[PDB]
Paper text:
One of the most promising candidates for inclusion in a transmission-blocking malaria vaccine is the gamete surface protein Pfs48/45, which is essential for development of the parasite in the mosquito midgut. Pfs48/45 is formed from three domains, with N- and C-terminal 6-cys domains joined by a central 4-cys domain, all linked to the gamete membrane through a C-terminal GPI anchor. Indeed, antibodies which bind Pfs48/45 can prevent transmission if ingested with the parasite as part of the mosquito bloodmeal. Here we present the structure of full-length Pfs48/45, showing its three domains to form a dynamic, planar, triangular arrangement.
The hinge between the variable and constant domains of Fabs is flexible. In case this flexibility reduced the degree of order within the crystals, we also generated scFv constructs for 85RF45.1, 32F3 and 10D8. These were purified, mixed with full-length Pfs48/45 and complexes were subjected to crystallisation trials. Crystals formed for the complex containing 32F3 scFv and a dataset was collected to 2.13 Å resolution, allowing structure determination by molecular replacement. This higher resolution data allowed us to build an improved model for the central domain of Pfs48/45. However, the density for the N-terminal domain was still too poorly resolved to allow building of a complete molecular model of this domain. Analysis of packing within the different crystals suggested that, in each case, the N-terminal domain lies within a substantial cavity within the crystal lattice, and the lack of packing against other regions of Pfs48/45 contributed to disorder of this domain, even within a well-ordered lattice. Recent improvements in protein structure prediction from AlphaFold2 provided a solution, allowing us to interpret the electron density maps for the N-terminal domain. While 32F3 approaches from the side of the disc, 85RF45.1 binds on the more exposed, membrane-distal surface, allowing greater accessibility to its epitope in the context of the gametocyte surface.
Author numbering:
A (entry chain A), C (entry chain A): 71 to 82, 125 to 127, 141 to 146, 175 to 191, 208 to 427
B (entry chain B), D (entry chain B): 30 to 150, 157 to 274
The structure:
């Protein structure tokens, strides 16, 4: 095993070993960790950066915390670590809107300290293909190809190529029909130069990075699937995702250099 | 011109050991953008890949049962597909379909021609001289006799892991037709009562309420490693 | 008149005035001029650069010269200046192949001096759209969109954007059907933000540059139209060209910054 | 769904000075990608642009004959086009067609609906309350009676320069149909005997050998400046 990625109380501070933020190289967490020891009127408002961590040390949480918002807003984090009553919050790389927050209640002493986190919103385009035809959407894509414009029984590609020493982008698609395979948790291998098959594989195995954040959304019969990549990849990786609506089909090919 | 069309020509009767050339005329699409195949159907109704050629025509594949006897070729300027068949055996007696796949449709055989018959000529029937050094597909049951309005399920077991299965429906007198793409994505026009599911070595096709229209042979097909293989088929019956 | 471009014996050395290479600013010719005064065995072989000039001073040319090749090759120049028996040759910016040459016969004294020019071939991609479906072509395009893949009655764009301080590129298209308008001598104006018409205009007026070289080719029912641009343009210019085959149509939009 | 379709609703009889709303249902295309127009046909068979709206619906244009009385609107989510018509005059009595253009097709009216009739109610006929402060199209002849197998030509003269002309053919009982796009590019299915040519203020449509099938009214149309205008039509006859 050449396990080499970031570590946040994951299984192979330390206690088969957990790792706070066969060769198993441990990378020191690439982001800032914000620790709270348990502000104005028993509540604490905190702005988090994309990927920034927030750890709370509190042994009293009477119900599920940081799983709901303290206003008309749901700030969803993909990693809410619960261990030895030391909850861990990982700020996402994508969010539906700026008007979003999450709440946690820590019963410290005989007072309810409630934490509220907000995002330092940054307008982010998705490097990918929009195969839908609605001009109304909360998502912006680098490429577009309205699948309704393609002929029945035809197959057309929409290519996306990424070429940066270090990456920090969102890759995804918008499909008004069926997505093949279950993108982006599983992607379709690139085409061979020889007469060889192309299989469905997990994206994690193809890119070979840990905690690859995956995001999703839906706006009518339009499905949005996305994923975030932060850092340099070991090798130039390519993969595909198919969108298909009735007799029309279009496929997104993605090539990421390094 | 018009919609997708594949016309197979040649075929008839050849003595054992003889030679014969088959041709396929493609019209209604950019031929050079598709992978082309010759897929035959034995008298036992087994489907077998005979040969395949890539888009540019530089890469070919032949299963060990035909390797060294058959030769696949394409003329992208004439929109034609050819198969030169040498040293013909009794096993080669089959209806030869010309069919297409695209890398972008997960190599799904979305169009098949009507087929050209070859009769090379003691008795036989079963198996198909295949099943060696390949992922084999085991379909069950062979005959599914169900009553209308019943929920039915047919299984497709694979000798070893396949990352997806394609389903095809065939009614007597016509070639196989796309039914379920990449395990669970229904083909165009396929009723909502049909569903497809599975992973690893176990896959299935289910129908929520069976009707007279569903009566046909359903074949599963895999392409996770060479050669590409199909199962034997599950004949759906409503007597 | 603010006539401001290159000058090669054109009408408004000097003799309403001609200019050897109302405000009329004369720019000194942006390329090298090669003069021949009238080599091995009464013939001269010369390699020319893209845009380089070659002037012959010879008062005796019994027939049309530099209009034909001295081998299985036709090296076509868009500007063959004939004035005061001082023929001028402007090397093109596009050529079908490397195996190409042009011949001229100068009757100097009592000997036939025959000049032969060849190109310093450089593999050049065309910034534009290939709407055809043949993989066999002598031209390479930056973008492709096989018009046969588009649905009947649908209209799809293929965009090309150029962004360089100084340009030296070929812009064009390959259409398997009808080209609208007569591209690239005349182009279709860009789309208005308001409900205003878009007209057919000359490309020369849109880009505002002189001697914009135009090239063409045909390979079956596939028509290739191209044009060359060398230098910085006064302002960010955009224009369109439509390709249409039966009920299918696709349009190339081109935006050139500066 | 299916192929392009435009259905006009509303219309009937309104007193002079009254109000009426017209609607158009678009199906079979991405509606939001097309510019939409209301174009009417007077009892004299003159074609006149009434209103136009851009793709997003943020920019509108109305000729001076309707400006301040009519209002064009679109609902891209419902695939609908609306026209609220106020202070109706006798001049407004016409068949109202719903039609589309695309920036990418050189603003050619490739699809027109069947039309919805409006009858607002002394006599009249001719002209059309238009012809002022616009490029006017003068077509000649008004009636072209030719013998079969003859070469015919009809002209379209413009009051001032137009950079292109579009030709449309209309046979009784049906709406206008695309015929010649951007001066010389024939529409889909149009026979090779037809040709279009011209520049500046002079344009023409020619037929190398006239047949029974060609008998129809041919209209020229320009859009080099607002408003967009059509000519009166050349009625081709073979008695
Ligand atoms: C096109 O989209 C319209 C607006 O969508 C709404 O706003 C976006 C930003 C998302 O929040 C989405 O979930 C909302 O529905 C719809 O009103 C309209 O019906 C859509 N049109 C079609 C044909 O789907
Ligand atoms: C596709 O192209 C084939 C080869 O074209 C030839 O070579 C190119 C490089 C040009 O020189 C061209 O003028 C030549 O024709 C053709 O043989 C073939 O017929 C073409 N296919 C179709 C359907 O047009």
């Amino acid at each position: 095993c050449t396990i080499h990625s970031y570590f946040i109380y994951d299984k192979i501070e330390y206690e088969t070993i957990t790792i706070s933020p066969v060769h198993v190289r441990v990378l020191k967490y690439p982001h800032n960790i914000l620790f709270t020891n348990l502000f104005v009127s028993n509540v604490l408002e905190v702005e988090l950066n994309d990927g920034e961590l927030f750890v709370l040390a509190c042994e009293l949480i009477n119900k599920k915390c940081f799983q709901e918002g303290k206003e008309k807003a749901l700030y969803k984090s993909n990693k809410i670590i619960y261990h030895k009553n030391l909850t861990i919050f990982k700020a996402p790389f994508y969010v539906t809107s700026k008007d979003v927050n999450t709440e946690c209640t820590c019963k410290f002493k005989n007072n309810n300290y409630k934490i509220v986190l907000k995002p330092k919103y940054e307008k982010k385009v998705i490097h990918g293909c929009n195969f839908s035809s609605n001009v109304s959407s909360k998502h912006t894509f680098t490429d577009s190809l309205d699948i309704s414009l393609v002929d029945d029984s035809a197959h057309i590609s929409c290519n996306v190529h990424l070429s940066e020493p270090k990456y920090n982008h969102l890759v995804g698609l918008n499909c008004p029909g069926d997505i093949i395979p279950d993108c982006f948790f599983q992607v379709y291998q690139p085409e061979s130069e020889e007469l060889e098959p192309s299989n469905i594989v997990y994206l994690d195995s193809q890119i070979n990075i840990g905690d690859i954040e995956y995001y999703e959304d839906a706006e009518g019969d339009d499905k949005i699937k996305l994923f975030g990549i932060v850092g340099s990849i070991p090798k130039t990786t390519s993969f595909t995702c198919i969108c298909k609506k009735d007799k029309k089909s279009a496929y997104m090919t993605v090539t990421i250099d390094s | 011109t018009g919609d997708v069309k594949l016309v197979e020509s040649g075929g008839g009767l050849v003595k054992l050991g003889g030679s014969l050339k088959l041709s396929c005329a493609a019209s209604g699409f950019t031929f050079s953008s598709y992978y082309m195949s010759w897929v035959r159907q034995t008298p036992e109704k087994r489907l077998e890949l005979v040969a395949a050629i890539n888009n540019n025509g530089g890469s070919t594949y032949y299963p060990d049962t035909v390797k060294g006897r058959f030769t696949i070729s394409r003329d992208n300027a004439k929109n034609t597909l050819n198969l030169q068949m040498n040293s013909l055996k009794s096993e080669d007696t089959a209806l030869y379909y010309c069919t297409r796949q695209h890398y972008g449709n997960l190599y799904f055989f979305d169009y098949w021609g009507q087929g050209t018959t070859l009769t090379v000529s003691s008795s036989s029937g079963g198996g198909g001289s295949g099943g060696g050094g390949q992922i084999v597909l085991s379909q069950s049951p062979a005959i599914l006799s169900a009553s209308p309005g019943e929920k039915v399920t047919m299984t497709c077991r694979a000798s070893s892991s396949v990352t997806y299965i394609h389903w095809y429906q065939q009614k007597p007198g016509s070639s196989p037709k796309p039914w379920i793409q990449a395990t669970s994505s229904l083909a165009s026009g396929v009723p909502a009562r049909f569903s497809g599911s599975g992973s690893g070595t176990s896959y299935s096709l289910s129908i929520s309420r069976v009707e007279a229209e569903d009566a046909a042979t359903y074949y599963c097909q895999q392409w996770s490693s060479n050669p590409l293989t199909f199962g034997a088929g599950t004949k759906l019956e409503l007597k």
